[PDB]
Subunit: 182 residues, 6 copies
């Protein structure tokens, strides 16, 4: 069973589900809208080998960024052309990592799924390529995997980028660890 | 909890969930198969800026369409080559918008998720790049975001293209508005 | 409602849900980790027409494989360069079919969703492009659709590749057929 | 998860839950009202020994019955007094077994609970001694255990006597029997 | 699906479930304790005929009441004996209607069941004849059907008398009434 | 959501729900049958005052007990008559407290309801005065409130006396106590 708006409000009110910052107007019929942070990550390696720590570069946009499909063959000329014509702060091609502004904490009886917003899916822009299910007990912001599959797409800082859908677990889960006191 | 075939039939029978047209043979163990409409949309802009109304072209296929991966570099020669060799009515590359033939209406206690069919996923053809969850209270046909990630794929008008999975909400949702009478 | 770790263990113990081979340490708060088999499939056709039986080649890796994004333009020189530098057994570009080592059987009251692991999504590598919901009653291994969307990614035989999330059905489903005896 | 009016309607429509006879007006927010049959059973043995076959007499009423609390001492004169004053066809004291008019069949994924009617509870008349849960897979009419705890109560043939609350099972049961 | 302490707290906080008055200390693992009001109702007619309007007397107690089993034969001397020995304000035999202090309102997606307090059950005192399920959409105080089955039992004004167990409905009900 | 036979089996196997002793044959479509212990408690005070400590006598039977309705007037001759005719070890009238043989422990996500056996309900014998819901987190044997409402009923040591219906909680409870 998926939590409706009424449930989302209840759980947030009692702190069963943490959402920071929380915006009551972001609560939908059965989901909670999340927004795009201004910090992005761009990898800098020939190939990705998870056995190692990948090399990357961190950038912060003032207002917007243009995400181009892979192999868009971006040149210095094309970049300045886009920045001037569309007033974007940064221009990237291929995959780029983003983050939600929202930090969340899930209880042991709730799992959440993140999904990119439909209006962006409509222009072939995704902010997550996997199902996006999150383990009960999870604490943190949501990492976004942004990729455009047709034409370059303009994304704006703080814009609604996706939604979290909350589902009840059949039973309380062992989140992986337990803590007590002296 | 996901609705089984028995539940799907019940809800459709009592009009709790509207599906038009409805085909009882499209009801699976825990989903409902939907079909591909003959109308598609192709955007025509350098970049996609959601602040504006995107430019596009509407096409209607007589029977089939060939969807090629992005940057397939389609030329007039290649198009006629495909149309003649595979008898396809249209040839496109990159993302293309489609629609289900089916129109649905969801009650305030049901959310639905659309997923592209497995047989097509098996050939790297997707008709939705996001989770595809639909808000309770939704009314309308399903918009498809079609993209091929390996080789061109032939799609046929009216073919089963995906499935809707229905989930119960924990509580009735506020669909966003309420209506009364004089 | 999604099954928690406690439920997963219960169902596996009573054989309601079959998982072979089963590793108790693969049970998470609300999912079960699956691993990557050593056999892969690569299609060999100009276009994919589902009306026919697609041509393909089966390969078996000794330890690892390098999955490059589509149109990576792999040459014999580049392949030997990768195999020597990263010690990979095979080098492929575009979509490649894989399989989980695990074979599963789902009861008539459970549906499962497969999702690629987050650590790999983080490097733009997916092992399924659709929602990945599996019908109740399903029996078999999970077919993986592997695609890299940014840079080549190294995958290792037997590594955890994704997770199965189990959901209860609202009612028992008709899996499609029934069997009796003389 | 208790079935709401809409769910009850759905399950009856698809024959997942059988209710014969069925009246849509008996469907409440989350229950289905059942009615009192005209047939009753009165045990005639000295004590109840479940290890033995119980003797009883079958009683059928035309319109109504007066249920008196145990030890009401129903003399021959008192019974006639009650029949003429309240127009009851039969007068009994202590326990009496009745039955719903409705015959039901439950699927392997539903369990139901029978509850006596609220209005009757308020006059200390009960139609069930136990909680009233009915196994998934059950088939049959519902046996009523009628007892009055304060003063005599008149029951009418075919009157609503209680309700069935339907609950979903977490998983399908093995209704082999 | 029965609501746990955390759920009850949430539903009361957002006013999905109304409970007036409300005391957080009455919230248990999966129920909410309710208390006994000082007002009771005693029927004064010879028999219960639901087809007619019932006559009754309104009784209000200051502190406590002694509930005796039916046919306890409460002579004038016995009543005074009980009042002086147990300091009860009123002595009654057989059934007596009471009410919870708490007024509740249930949403269209919740049904509740009232259950008599365990400690009282152990002394054979019941405060409800039926299963106790309350329709989704219900509004009002809970009517108590009090009867003692073994020996007289003293009940105190405002004491915890039972509990409400809340259950989720599978779907929203049509609480038009 | 009520647990089905398969769920009960799973929860007992993983020790989520403790039942000692446990017999797989007692698992029904959606319940678990419990049995009658040989120990009973009979209160010996004039009235029940929960504000005070209750006096009682401990009774243990070898094989069976005869439960008579209240005010059955069990003279010395009547008792011997019943013992010799029905081979019962003890004869009591009114309420008697019993206990299940089974000891249980419930997890923070399950609540259980005890219900008296159907066959016994049909002979107007009840083993619980309240609805019977048991808090999540509970540990212990189940106390039985036995009362006969029609005629004397013979109960046998170790016989199935009722059943436990297990329900899932919507969320985990805070079973601190
Ligand atoms: N008030 C009642 C009483 C009984 N029954 C039904 C359900 C029971 O399963 C059946 C009686 O079965 P048994 O005669 O076999 O009684 P048992 O005690 O021997 O078995 P069980 O405990 O399963 O009822 O009748 C009913 O619908 N309403
Ligand atoms: N112990 C009780 C008894 C009753 N009620 C409430 C719920 C009932 O719906 C209402 C009584 O309604 P009616 O007077 O209309 O009784 P009816 O039998 O005629 O209708 P119903 O079967 O719906 O109760 O009072 C309650 O909260 N506690
Ligand atoms: N038939 C019964 C009666 C009681 N109990 C258990 C569950 C109760 O929580 C406990 C009795 O607790 P108390 O002695 O504290 O009774 P109280 O009324 O004071 O508290 P509570 O209302 O929680 O029971 O015994 C049981 O399993 N079966």
């Amino acid at each position: 069973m998926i939590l409706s708006d009424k449930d989302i409000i209840d759980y947030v009110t009692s702190k069963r589900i943490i959402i920071k910052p929380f915006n009551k107007d972001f609560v939908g019929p059965c989901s909670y809208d999340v927004t795009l942070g201004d910090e992005f990550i761009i990898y800098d390696d020939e190939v990705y080998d998870l056995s190692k720590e990948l090399n990357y570069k961190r950038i912060k946009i003032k207002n917007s960024i243009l995400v181009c499909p892979l192999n868009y063959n971006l040149t210095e000329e094309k970049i300045n052309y886009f920045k001037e014509k569309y007033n974007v702060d940064y221009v990237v091609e291929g995959g780029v990592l983003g983050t939600t502004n929202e930090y969340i904490e899930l209880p042991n009886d709730i799992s959440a799924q993140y999904q990119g917003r439909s209006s962006l899916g409509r222009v072939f822009l995704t902010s997550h390529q996997t199902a996006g299910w999150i383990d009960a007990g999870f604490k943190g912001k949501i990492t976004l995997e942004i990729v455009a599959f047709d034409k370059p797409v303009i994304l704006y800082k703080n814009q609604r980028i996706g939604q979290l859908i909350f589902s009840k677990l059949l039973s309380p889960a062992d989140v992986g660890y337990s803590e007590r006191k002296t």
